PDB file of C-alpha atoms in Angstrom:
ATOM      1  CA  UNK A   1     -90.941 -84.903 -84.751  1.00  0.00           C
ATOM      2  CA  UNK A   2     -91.066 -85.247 -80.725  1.00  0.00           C
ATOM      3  CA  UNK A   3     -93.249 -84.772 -77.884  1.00  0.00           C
ATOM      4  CA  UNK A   4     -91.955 -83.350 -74.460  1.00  0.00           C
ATOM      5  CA  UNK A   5     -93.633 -86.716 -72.390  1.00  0.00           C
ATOM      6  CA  UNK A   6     -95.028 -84.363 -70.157  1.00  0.00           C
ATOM      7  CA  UNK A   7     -96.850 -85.463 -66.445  1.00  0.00           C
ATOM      8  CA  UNK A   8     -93.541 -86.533 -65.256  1.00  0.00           C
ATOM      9  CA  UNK A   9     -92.877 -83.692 -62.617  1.00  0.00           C
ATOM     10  CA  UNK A  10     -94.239 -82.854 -59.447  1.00  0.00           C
ATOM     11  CA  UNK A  11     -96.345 -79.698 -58.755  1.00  0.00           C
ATOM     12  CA  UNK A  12     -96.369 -76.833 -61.414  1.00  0.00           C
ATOM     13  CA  UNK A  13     -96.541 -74.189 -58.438  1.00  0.00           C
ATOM     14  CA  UNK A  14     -94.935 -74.639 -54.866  1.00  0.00           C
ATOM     15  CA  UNK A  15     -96.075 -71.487 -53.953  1.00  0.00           C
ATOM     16  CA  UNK A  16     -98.799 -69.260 -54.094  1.00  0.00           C
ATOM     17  CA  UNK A  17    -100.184 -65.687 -54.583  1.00  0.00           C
ATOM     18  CA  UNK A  18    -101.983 -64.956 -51.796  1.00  0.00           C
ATOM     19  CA  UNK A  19    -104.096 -62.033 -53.196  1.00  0.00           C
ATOM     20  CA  UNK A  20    -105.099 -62.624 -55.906  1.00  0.00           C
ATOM     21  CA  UNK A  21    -107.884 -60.239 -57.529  1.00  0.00           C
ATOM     22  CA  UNK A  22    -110.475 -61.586 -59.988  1.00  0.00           C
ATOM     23  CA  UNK A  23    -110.050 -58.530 -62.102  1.00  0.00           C
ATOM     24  CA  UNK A  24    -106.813 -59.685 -63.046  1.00  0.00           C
ATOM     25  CA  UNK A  25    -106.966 -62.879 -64.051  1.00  0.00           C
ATOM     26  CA  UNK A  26    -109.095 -64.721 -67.467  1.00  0.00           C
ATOM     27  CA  UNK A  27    -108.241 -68.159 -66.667  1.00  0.00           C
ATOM     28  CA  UNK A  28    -108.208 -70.608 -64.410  1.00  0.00           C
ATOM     29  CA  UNK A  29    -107.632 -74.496 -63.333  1.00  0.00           C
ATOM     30  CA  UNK A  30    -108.121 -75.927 -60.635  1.00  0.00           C
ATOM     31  CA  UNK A  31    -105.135 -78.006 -59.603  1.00  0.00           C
ATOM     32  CA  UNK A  32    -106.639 -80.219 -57.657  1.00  0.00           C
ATOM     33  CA  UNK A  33    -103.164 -82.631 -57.172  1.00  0.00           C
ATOM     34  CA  UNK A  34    -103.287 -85.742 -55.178  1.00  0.00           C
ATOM     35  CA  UNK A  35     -99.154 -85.588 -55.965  1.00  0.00           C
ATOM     36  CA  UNK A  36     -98.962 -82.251 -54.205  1.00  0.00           C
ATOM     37  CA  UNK A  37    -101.654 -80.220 -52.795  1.00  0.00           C
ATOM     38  CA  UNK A  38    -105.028 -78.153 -53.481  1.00  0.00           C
ATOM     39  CA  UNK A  39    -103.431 -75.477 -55.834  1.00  0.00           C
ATOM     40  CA  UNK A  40    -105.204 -72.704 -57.200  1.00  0.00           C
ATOM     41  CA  UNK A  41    -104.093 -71.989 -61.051  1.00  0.00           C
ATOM     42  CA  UNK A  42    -104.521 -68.869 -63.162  1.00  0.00           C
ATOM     43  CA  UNK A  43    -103.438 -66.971 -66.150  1.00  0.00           C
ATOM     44  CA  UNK A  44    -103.507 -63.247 -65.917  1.00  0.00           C
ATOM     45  CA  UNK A  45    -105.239 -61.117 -68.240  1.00  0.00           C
ATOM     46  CA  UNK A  46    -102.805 -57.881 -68.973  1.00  0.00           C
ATOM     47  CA  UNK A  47     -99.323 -59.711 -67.771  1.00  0.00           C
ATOM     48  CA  UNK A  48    -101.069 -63.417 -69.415  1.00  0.00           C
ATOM     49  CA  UNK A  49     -98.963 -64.933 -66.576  1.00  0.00           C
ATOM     50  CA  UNK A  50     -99.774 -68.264 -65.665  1.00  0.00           C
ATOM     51  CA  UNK A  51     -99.419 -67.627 -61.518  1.00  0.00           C
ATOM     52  CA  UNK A  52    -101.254 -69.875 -58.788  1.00  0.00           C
ATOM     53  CA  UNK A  53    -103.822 -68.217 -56.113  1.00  0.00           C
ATOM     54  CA  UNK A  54    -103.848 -68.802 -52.334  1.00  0.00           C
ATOM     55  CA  UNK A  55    -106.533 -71.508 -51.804  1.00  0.00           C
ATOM     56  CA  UNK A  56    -107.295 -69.681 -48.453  1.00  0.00           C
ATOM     57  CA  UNK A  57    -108.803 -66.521 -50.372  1.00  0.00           C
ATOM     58  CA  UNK A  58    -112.187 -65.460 -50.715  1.00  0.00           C
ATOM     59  CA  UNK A  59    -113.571 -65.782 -54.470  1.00  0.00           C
ATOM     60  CA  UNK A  60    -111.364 -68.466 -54.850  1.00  0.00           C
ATOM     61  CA  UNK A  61    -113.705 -70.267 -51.976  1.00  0.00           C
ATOM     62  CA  UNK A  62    -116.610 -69.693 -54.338  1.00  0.00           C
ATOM     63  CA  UNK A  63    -114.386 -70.674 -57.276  1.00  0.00           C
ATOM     64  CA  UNK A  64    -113.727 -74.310 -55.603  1.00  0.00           C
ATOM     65  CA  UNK A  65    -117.403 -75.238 -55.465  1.00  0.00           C
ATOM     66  CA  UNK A  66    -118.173 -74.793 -59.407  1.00  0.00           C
ATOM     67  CA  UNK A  67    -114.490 -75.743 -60.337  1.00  0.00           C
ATOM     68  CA  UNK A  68    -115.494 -79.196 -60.114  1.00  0.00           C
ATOM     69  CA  UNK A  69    -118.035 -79.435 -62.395  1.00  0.00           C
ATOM     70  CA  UNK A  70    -115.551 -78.434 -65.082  1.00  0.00           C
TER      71      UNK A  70
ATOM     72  CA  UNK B   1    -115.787 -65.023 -58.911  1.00  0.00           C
ATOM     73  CA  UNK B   2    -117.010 -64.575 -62.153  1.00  0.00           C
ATOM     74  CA  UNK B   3    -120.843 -64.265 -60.761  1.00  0.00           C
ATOM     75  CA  UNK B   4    -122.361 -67.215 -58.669  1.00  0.00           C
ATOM     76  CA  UNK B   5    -118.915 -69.459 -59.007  1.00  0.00           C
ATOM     77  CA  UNK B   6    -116.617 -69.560 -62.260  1.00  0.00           C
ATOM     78  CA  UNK B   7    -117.106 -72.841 -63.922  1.00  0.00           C
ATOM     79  CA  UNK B   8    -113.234 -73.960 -64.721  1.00  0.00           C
ATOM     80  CA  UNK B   9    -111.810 -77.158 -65.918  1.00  0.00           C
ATOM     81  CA  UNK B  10    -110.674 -79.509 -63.095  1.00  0.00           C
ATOM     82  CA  UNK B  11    -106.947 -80.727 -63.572  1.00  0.00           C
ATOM     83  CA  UNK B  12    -105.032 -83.483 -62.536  1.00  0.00           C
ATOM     84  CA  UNK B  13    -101.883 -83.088 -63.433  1.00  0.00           C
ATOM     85  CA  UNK B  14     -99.986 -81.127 -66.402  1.00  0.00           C
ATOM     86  CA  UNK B  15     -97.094 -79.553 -68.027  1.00  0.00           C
ATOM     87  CA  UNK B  16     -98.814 -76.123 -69.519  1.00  0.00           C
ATOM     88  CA  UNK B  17     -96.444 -74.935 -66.592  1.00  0.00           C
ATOM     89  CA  UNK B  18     -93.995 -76.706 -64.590  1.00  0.00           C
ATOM     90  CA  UNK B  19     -92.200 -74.575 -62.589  1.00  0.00           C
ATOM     91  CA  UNK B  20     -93.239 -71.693 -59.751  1.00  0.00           C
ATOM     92  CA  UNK B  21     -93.756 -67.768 -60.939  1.00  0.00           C
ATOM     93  CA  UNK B  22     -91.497 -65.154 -59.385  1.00  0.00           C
ATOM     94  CA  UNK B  23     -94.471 -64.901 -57.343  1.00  0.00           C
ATOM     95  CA  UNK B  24     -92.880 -65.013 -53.728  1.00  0.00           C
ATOM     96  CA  UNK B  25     -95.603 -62.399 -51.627  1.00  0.00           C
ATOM     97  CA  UNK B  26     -98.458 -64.236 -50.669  1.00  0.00           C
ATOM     98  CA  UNK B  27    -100.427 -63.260 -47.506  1.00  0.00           C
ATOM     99  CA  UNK B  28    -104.141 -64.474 -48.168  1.00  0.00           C
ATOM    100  CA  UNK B  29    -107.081 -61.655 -47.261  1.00  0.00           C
ATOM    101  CA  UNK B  30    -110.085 -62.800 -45.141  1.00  0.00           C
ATOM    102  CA  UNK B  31    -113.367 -61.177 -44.466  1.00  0.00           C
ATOM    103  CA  UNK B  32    -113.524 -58.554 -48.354  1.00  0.00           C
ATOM    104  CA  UNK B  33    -116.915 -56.967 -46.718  1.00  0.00           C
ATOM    105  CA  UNK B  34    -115.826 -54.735 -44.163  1.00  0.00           C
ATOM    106  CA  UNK B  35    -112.324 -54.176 -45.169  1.00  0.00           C
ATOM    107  CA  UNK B  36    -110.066 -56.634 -47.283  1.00  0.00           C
ATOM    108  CA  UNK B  37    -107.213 -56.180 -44.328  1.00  0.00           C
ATOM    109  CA  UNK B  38    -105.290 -54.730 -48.187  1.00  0.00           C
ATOM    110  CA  UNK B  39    -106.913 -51.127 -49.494  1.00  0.00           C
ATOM    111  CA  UNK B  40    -106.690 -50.520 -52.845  1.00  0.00           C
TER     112      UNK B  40
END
């Protein structure tokens, strides 16, 4: 069998969703790129999406804090 | 967000997605006390 190599791009979201709601989303990452930028990652609950969150928001401030303790 | 913080999984760099959502709105709220600038 194969394995996609994976890694080998550059960011996984050049843009963001600005708003965001908590309520909406299960999952996150935090996408914390020295390749691109501070990107804020997250998989929606109802639509499962995987969509990326404004760094600039509000929760998400809280979010970065205790993202980096993984 | 989820009470004091959330508590996610810091990444470097992966392919779980590699391209951009259809996700072209973005304008950012600010204060969420008073008013979110966005009712809903």
């Amino acid at each position: 069998g194969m394995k996609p190599v994976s890694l080998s791009y550059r960011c996984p979201c050049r843009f963001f969703e600005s708003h965001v709601a908590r309520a909406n989303v299960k999952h996150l990452k935090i996408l914390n790129t020295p390749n691109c930028a501070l990107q804020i990652v997250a998989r929606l609950k109802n639509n499962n999406r995987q969509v990326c969150i404004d760094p600039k928001c509000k929760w998400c401030q809280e979010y970065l804090e205790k993202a980096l303790n993984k | 967000g989820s009470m004091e913080g959330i508590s996610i999984y810091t990444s470097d760099n992966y392919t779980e997605e590699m391209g951009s959502g259809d996700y072209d709105s973005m304008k950012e709220p600010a204060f969420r006390e008073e008013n979110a600038n966005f009712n809903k």
